[PDB]
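## tool: complex_structure
## caller: assistant
## args:
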Amino acid sequence: GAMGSMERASLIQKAKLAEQAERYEDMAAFMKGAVEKGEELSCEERNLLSVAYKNVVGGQRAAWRVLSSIEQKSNEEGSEEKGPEVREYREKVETELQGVCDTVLGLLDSHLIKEAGDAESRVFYLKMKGDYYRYLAEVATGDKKRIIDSARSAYQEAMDISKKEMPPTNPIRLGLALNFSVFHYEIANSPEEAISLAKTTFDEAMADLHTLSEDSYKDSTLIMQLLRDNLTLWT
Amino acid sequence: GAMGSMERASLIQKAKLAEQAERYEDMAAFMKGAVEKGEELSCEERNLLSVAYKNVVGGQRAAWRVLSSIEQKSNEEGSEEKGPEVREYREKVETELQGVCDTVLGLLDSHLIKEAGDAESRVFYLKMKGDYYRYLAEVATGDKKRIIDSARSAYQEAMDISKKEMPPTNPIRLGLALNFSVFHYEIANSPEEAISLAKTTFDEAMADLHTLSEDSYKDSTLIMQLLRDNLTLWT
Amino acid sequence: FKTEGPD
Amino acid sequence: FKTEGPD
Ligand SMILES: [Cl-]
Ligand SMILES: [Cl-]
Ligand SMILES: [Mg+2]
Ligand SMILES: [Mg+2]
Ligand SMILES: [Mg+2]
Ligand SMILES: [Mg+2]
Ligand SMILES: [Mg+2]
Ligand SMILES: [Mg+2]
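## result:
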């Protein structure tokens, strides 16, 4: 791997510099190198891994959505034939997106999840596995059912652990629930399930805010507001 | 070249899709492929080439500035030694930036400039040559004088042609003058020259606005406002 | 719809 | 300082 000669600590340090420079593909490559050293990741390092790949895949998803919209308009009645180029370029972007998802899923399978024993690490990684299968599902049109079921399975395992091992205000638990609710609404065609999950999660967090410090309260309420924003859109 | 098997018209079409998707590295690669077909570029195609590379190099320049600032702070009295990583990563970004500038300069030398006979094409390409030498000068610390003189020479040839062949309101002439004024101020340590050029250019354009259609007036006054914004910063 | 983290 | 075109 191109990062095999670089110290782990140097890869972490450069990931943080890349973040400051908004060089997210570099950040992801540094964090992939750090994972491939074989040691478990700290909380801070997990979050660098997630921020890096989320920014890379987010750019790809946005591009794919633009291209797919253009392609769909091209396939409307009375649209002029323009040749294979829009499909080809949408496919190019799609294939690159799938490649990034496969890279992340591969890091999780070899060997982040199997060595993660604490609830905070294991839930974090299982949520990531659900997220990247969800991004694969957004572009899938052929195995689609199996991709969807892989996302669902990862999210459900993360949910089961989080409900047993973490308080209802924990930010990783809250972000998991937020994302699993969007899976239900956008991917699984289950808007009622999405709404029920978001509601239950919000209400259970609200009842436990009284236990928190001012700083923890800020962290939890930020995610709660995201649940509220989706519930406003959906109801 | 990876684009050698793709039709010229398909490369242009995909450059425009990449622009809509904000996929500027793809856009640049498509436009490089189009240039390498060997035919001259239309006005629209010149502008796609410029927008693509300007966005790619702009991201690199922004990243370089962040990293260089961090590196300079590290070299201040009482800063803790943190090792070679900030310098290494600044160098990585710098080398990639230089590579993009060299790619653009190479397209201009082989063979865009030599086949450009009309003032609009030749001025456009010579301005681009000044711009990419200017971006090389921003990071140069060693040949620095020769890089600066190459920028200056390109801009001066473009200026000489533009003053003979184009009206004072022409947008390419105005953007050339704007950029050459910033060269004087930022690169050549010639703030008086920068201010004189920006002033003269603005005033000569203002005196010829009366000749223009409403649409041309909008195009010219947009660039004039940029000259005004720099003059406000500099005076 | 909102999901966790940056875009 | 402003130069021509996008960033
Ligand atoms: Cl393509
Ligand atoms: Cl590096
Ligand atoms: Mg070591
Ligand atoms: Mg496909
Ligand atoms: Mg109902
Ligand atoms: Mg042909
Ligand atoms: Mg260097
Ligand atoms: Mg003076």
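## assistant note: Chains D and A do not touch (no CB pair under 8 Å). Residues A 192 surround magnesium ion (ligand 5) (CB under 6 Å). Handing back to user.
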